Amino acid sequence: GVPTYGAIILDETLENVLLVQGYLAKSGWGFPKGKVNKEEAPHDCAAREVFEETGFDIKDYICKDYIELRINDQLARLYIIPGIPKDTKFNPKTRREIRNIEWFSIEKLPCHRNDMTPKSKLGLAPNKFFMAIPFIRPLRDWLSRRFG
Ligand SMILES: CCCc1cc(C(=O)NCc2ccc(F)cc2)[nH]n1
Numbered sequence: 001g002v003p004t005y006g007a008i009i010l011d012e013t014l015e016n017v018l019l020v021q022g023y024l025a026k027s028g029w030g031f032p033k034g035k036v037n038k039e040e041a042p043h044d045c046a047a048r049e050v051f052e053e054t055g056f057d058i059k060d061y062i063c064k065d066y067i068e069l070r071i072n073d074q075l076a077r078l079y080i081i082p083g084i085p086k087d088t089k090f091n092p093k094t095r096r097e098i099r100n101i102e103w104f105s106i107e108k109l110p111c112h113r114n115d116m117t118p119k120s121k122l123g124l125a126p127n128k129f130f131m132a133i134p135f136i137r138p139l140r141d142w143l144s145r146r147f148g
Contacts, residue, residue: 006033030131
């Protein structure tokens with residue numbers, strides 16, 4: 001697949017992250033991100049997707065040196081943007097693609113989906129944070145290294 005770029009936006013306390021909820025196939029909560037256009041630079045795609053999806057422009061706050069994961073053939077890179085005040089008014093451009101935009105406490109998000117071992121059944125229970133989950137442990141580790 002085509003690389004995706006976006007951001008992990010944190011508040012001033014570093015306890016909360018900004019997630020967006022789409023529709024249909026993309027009905028759960030995840031970090032704002034999207035497909036790179038041909039000839040577009042990563043930092044530019046990231047700002048554009050985050051602007052389209054949240055109304056907030058990160059261009060002045062991106063530091064070039066993020067968390068990146070190869071998930072089933074596809075790279076997803078989210079630039080880390082700390083210190084965005086919780087009272088920022090976020091508004092998507094395309095309300096046809098984004099249902100809602102909320103802050104979530106990092107410490108209450110799961111960093112793995114639960115199994116179904118009290119049902120003797122294989123796989124994972126559904127989780128509305130499926131798309132965010134793979135970034136939560138790496139973000140927690142990055143915040144420990146960079147801060148304390
Ligand atoms: C395996 C289930 C597939 C899936 C993918 C997503 C998702 O990405 N939602 C968040 C989101 C929505 C819209 C958007 F523009 C940016 C992020 N949710 N469920």
